[PDB]
Design a protein around this ligand. Structure first.
Ligand SMILES: [Mn+2]
Ligand SMILES: [Mn+2]
Lengths: 154, 154
């Protein structure tokens, strides 16, 4: 049985027996390549006290499905639209939260619209900068870099 | 200023202004290949109500550094030891938690020791099973599969 200690905005905290559980909305993330650069974003993240390298991402809102949320976050964070394909999903940290992230690929980007910093960067350079301690990754940023190296080169 | 609503075992819940923040211990995860199979693990995860495909992983304990924790979790979850190399790190979900995961590669595995199910599986098969809806991934499991496809084939 789940017992709730806190019901919030972007999370609930519950106990189930001995387990501490954070309920959290599902999320999306969008991998986009153009001219060899990946579309990263950065924003101040108070939970970690720095701005990691991420890809466009956000929470799925009421009424939306993952594809719709991915379209919305790409537009809202970067002003772009594209042709979206679902790739895969993952639980961010299933030892304590149910947050599930749905990852899409965007192709054929177009500007639809003239907090969030847009950081186009070659994924090889993002990985080198991280290896040298210059930038941190979110899970979504690291997934984008690894997916590119696995499946999008040449 | 952080104000605390809950101080727990594996997390604290705090408010910082409008932000809900979950403090959480840092973690490790270990990528290991043998004979074409990756070392996955599965366990019941009450937060998500299922057993996703993960790689050996766990929290860093007091007094340990990431490399030591990675050695310990590989031994405790699978009974193996290996030569460990640090690869990279990521924040699991920096919009609400500070959990940071340090990922290692293990090579030259040896059995040192005769809850957690050990699932050796080709990463190509793990990705196909996930694409067909048969298994879910944790971030660590997906990172292991993508890292293999990017850097460990042939
Ligand atoms: Mn902006
Ligand atoms: Mn076991």
């Amino acid at each position: 049985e789940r017992t709730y200690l806190y019901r919030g905005r972007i999370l609930n905290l519950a106990l189930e027996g001995r387990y501490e559980i954070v309920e959290h909305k599902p999320a999306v993330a969008v991998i986009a390549l153009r001219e060899g650069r990946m579309l990263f974003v950065r924003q101040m993240r108070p939970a970690v006290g720095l701005a990691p390298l991420e890809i466009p991402a956000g929470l799925i809102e009421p009424g939306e499905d993952p594809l719709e949320a991915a379209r919305r976050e790409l537009a809202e964070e970067t002003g772009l639209s594209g042709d979206l394909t679902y790739l895969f999903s993952y639980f961010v940290s299933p030892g304590f939260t149910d947050e599930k992230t749905h990852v899409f690929l965007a192709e054929n980007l177009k500007e639809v619209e003239a907090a969030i910093e847009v950081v186009w960067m070659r994924p090889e350079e993002a990985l080198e900068r991280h290896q040298r301690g210059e930038v941190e990754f979110s899970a979504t940023g690291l997934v984008g870099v690894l997916y590119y190296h696995a499946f999008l080169r040449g």
